[model samples]
Target: KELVLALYDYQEKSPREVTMKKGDILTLLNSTNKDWWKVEVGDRQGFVPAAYVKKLD
Candidate 1:
């Protein structure tokens, strides 16, 4: 991995769970956009706003 990712707003931790104020670090596998990326946290996968993520590259 070249970069470490974090969440802004809280989404569901578990697929069936819910989170609105919870945030956690995510794993950055690959990027699907120029500044955007595809990350996985817990068991959920989604796109996070790149502006909030600190890029190591």
Candidate 2:
């Protein structure tokens, strides 16, 4: 797992959104989905679209 930051308000009704704002740092756990990636925010883990985040360079 690695760290990443939320760049926008990503809300999805299907697999569901991780619910975060811009500049929120999260832990990336999985990248199985092409459009979505599993991340851990605080104590909760969920899917967020791949386009909505940028890796910590």
Candidate 3:
């Protein structure tokens, strides 16, 4: 997993998605998708918009 920063708020009402808040720091599982990203949150992992996450080293 890699560290990433949330650049904007992305709220998802559906399953398999993360509700990200601006300034949220999440663990990125992968980034192979062109528009979606798999990230880790509290006790779960879900997809968020790739544009909303800034990968961090």
CA displacement after TM-score superposition, residue 17 of candidate 2 (Å) = 3.4
Choose the strongest candidate by lDDT. Answer: 3
Which of candidates 1 and 3 reaches a greater TM-score? Answer: 3
How high a TM-score does candidate 3 get?
0.88
| Model 3 steric clash pairs | none
Which candidate has the highest TM-score of all? 3
Q: Please, what is the whole-model Cα lDDT of each candidate in the order they appear?
A: 0.53, 0.82, 0.87
- The alpha-carbon deviation from the true structure for residue 43 of candidate 1, after best TM-score superposition, in angstroms, is 0.8
**lDDT of model 3 at residue 44?**
75
Writing each residue's lDDT as its tens digit, candidate 2 over 1-57 gives 889899997665665566767888989988878888898877888998888988894
The alpha-carbon RMSD values of the candidates against the true structure, listed in the order shown, are 5.0, 1.7, 1.1
Candidates arranged by TM-score, highest first:
3, 2, 1
Give each model a TM-score. Answer: 0.51, 0.81, 0.88
Off by over 4 Å in 2: none
Candidate 1: deviation at residue 31, Å? 2.2
